[PDB]
Amino acid sequence: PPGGGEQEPPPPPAPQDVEMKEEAATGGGSTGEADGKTAAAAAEHSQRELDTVTLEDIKEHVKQLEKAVSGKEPRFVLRALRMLPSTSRRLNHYVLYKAVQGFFTSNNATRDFLLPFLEEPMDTEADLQFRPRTGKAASTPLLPEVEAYLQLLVVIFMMNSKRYKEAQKISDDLMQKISTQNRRALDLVAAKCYYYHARVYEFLDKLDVVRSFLHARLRTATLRHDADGQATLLNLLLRNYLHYSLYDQAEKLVSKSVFPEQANNNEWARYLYYTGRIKAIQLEYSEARRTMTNALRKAPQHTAVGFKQTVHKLLIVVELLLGEIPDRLQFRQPSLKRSLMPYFLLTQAVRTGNLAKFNQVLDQFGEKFQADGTYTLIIRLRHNVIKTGVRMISLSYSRISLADIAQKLQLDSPEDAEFIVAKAIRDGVIEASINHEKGYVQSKEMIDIYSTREPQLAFHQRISFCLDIHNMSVKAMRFP
Amino acid sequence: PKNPDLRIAQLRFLLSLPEHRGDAAVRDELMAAVRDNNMAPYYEALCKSLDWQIDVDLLNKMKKANEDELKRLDEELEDAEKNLGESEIRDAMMAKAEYLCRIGDKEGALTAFRKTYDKTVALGHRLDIVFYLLRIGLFYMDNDLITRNTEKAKSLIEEGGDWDRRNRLKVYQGLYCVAIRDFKQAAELFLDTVSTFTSYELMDYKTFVTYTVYVSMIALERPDLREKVIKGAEILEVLHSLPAVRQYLFSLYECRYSVFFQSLAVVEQEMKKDWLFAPHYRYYVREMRIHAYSQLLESYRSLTLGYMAEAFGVGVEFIDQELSRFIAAGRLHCKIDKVNEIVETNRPDSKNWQYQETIKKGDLLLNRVQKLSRVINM
Amino acid sequence: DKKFHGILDQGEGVLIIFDEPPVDKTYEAALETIQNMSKVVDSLYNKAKKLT
């Protein structure tokens, strides 16, 4: 008891230093940033706000409990108060509570006590200028609060937090609307909060009506005011719509637009991941391979953690259906390797020309594919395994017997030996000419057209890409 | 002052991969552990090997006697630094300081190295420090710091010119090129051959004969292969000493395909036990296959696999699937007629392969610069 | 020995000579990409210094 008793005092003041001055310098800086400049946006403290939310989300969040700093939840949500010249005295009151916690023990009030607390910005009457500062001061305890996952009686307080946030959203839609600039700082928050909507709804019930609300918001952004918001709303849509049948596939074509400009950076690329799986369901790989590859090269630098690895899990799927696949252990990660071991044996047996080798992996390792929902490829990949085997045997043998080729590929009968080749010629897989008497299959090697057509088609991508590098370099070079 | 520790790296690789050797591989390692008082090196091997029973006081009185031997030099410097001179103090401490870190880990070495780099006004002791980085680079198989100091030493060496240390570095870059996979640069840097003779950092010279001859059978073309062994006088005797290694060379020039399985058999058993070859040995297996198949298929335009059964004894379907997988890899294109037992050559590869290397490397290079281009900015 | 170019036949007893001498145009490109390796590698040091 003496040791732990003396180790209790030191921790609580560490946040009570940083977390006290954190949203006071960031929120209080964005307070003057919101009055003017306001160009664009920027509001560079909005990017700093991403960094701060992610800062507490590692350490120390809000609470707990901990029976020490749990009084910060009512502290920052109290005392607007009220107009800016009256806020000086309140900024001093925030510091008076430091001596209160230093003299006597700190008071903890959470859970049922949060109902009047969250209604105290409405009781103060009022902030009254900044809805995003009140949305941030109310959300900042609520957002890491989801990390409790107690699921009993405080989730309906998260529903009350969506209701209080909807009050702040009525105030977001009615107020301003001409050079709003509160919306552009709030669209990051409407993003995060709507993702927390779906997060909380995943633990109870999927949201059918909240998508009616979400689509009201979605379509209502265009054309009046959309900055960075609708790009996130479309990904909210796609996120549970990809998990929930159906039609959502062609839904994107009527939504686009694009929507430009792509934001926020990697946040657009992940959108390309979602639509990459979607466009994979239409079996078009050429459109799917580029959207998959762009997702990985457009996302730096991690950590964290496993979703950047999963996007790569589905990256090489479309390339495996293509028939041309690079060896995937060049992207091998110590945290990723352990996860795709069964998957890695899959691609290992896929690149081979043995059909039985491939059918064994589905039997033993299908249990993992059930969780990923990746069985959509396993039916259509067989076509690619047989096409791979026949490609090998085509280039590697001048003249092959159709009856003797069936034993190696376990083709089992003479009749399908003609069928594979028939569609092989139909798809341009092999140029060989086949004679049916016995029958036999002969093949010929033709070239010299070759470097006429193929390199110029590549050059069309090469040079255009190089001049695009030139344009992107000139753009960032002319700013000084 | 290296080979006693280098052979310890040999025995740690000998213990690590095979789990079937529980006797002669631990005995020689403890034989070298009771001496020189290696302390930190055996902890990593204690986790893999057995935990005994008892080490404890047996190695605790030795590490305390090593710390008394450590503190007696550390107690000699401040009586030595009272007087003063040029290097006579700081150089007196560093040698035994790197031996004291030879007892354990990388620490006392890494501090002593950056310590002495500001002391010596000549490359004599500098490159000796570099050699310490190379030997430790072999023990901990850490290739990070050995590529740097070597690049920095080549500039101080060639300002400039050298004999012994130059031909030493020629072998060092061969050890790094053989650690990773580089076949042409390894044999090129191995051109000094007997001029380095026996050296402690070069370990056994008889085994250096074998290492330098194992690379010459790949990246060296046949005219040049016999150009090195037949025309080179210094290398002609050492091969005459070992009849097993000589067998492979003269049988390779003799083109006899019956012995290649038996000779590569021995070469493969030695490839497994020796270190650094574990990653790279499986590529070598097929390397020598295509190198024999080259001279094979270049003689006759039409050939039958039934004739190959006579030289191979006896391949039927074996070489069928074999050659098929060599063709699928774009290695020595040849057109084989299935079920008709005919092989055709061709291949006038100077057309497509001439132009194919350009696309193969071009795609990888430009795909690299694509990532670097999108990095800046964000 | 490469001093002579062609191909033989054991069955028909036929030697055929064929030659396509020039290798220069590929050497052009090959020796380029090989050095451009160290080009990009050298760019990673500056790109790493500006960012961190």
């Binding site: 590098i469 030139h470 000084p480 | - | 500006k50």
Partner: peptide, 30 residues
């Protein structure tokens, strides 16, 4: 190939030297 060879070099010198001369020169002024 030579085109794309020097295109990356132009972007190299330009972007590297300019981004440094942009943020590192502005940070000392303000």
């Amino acid at each position: 190939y030579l085109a794309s060879l020097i295109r990356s070099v132009v972007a190299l010198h330009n972007l590297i030297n300019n981004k440094i001369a942009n943020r590192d020169a502005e940070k000392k002024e303000g």
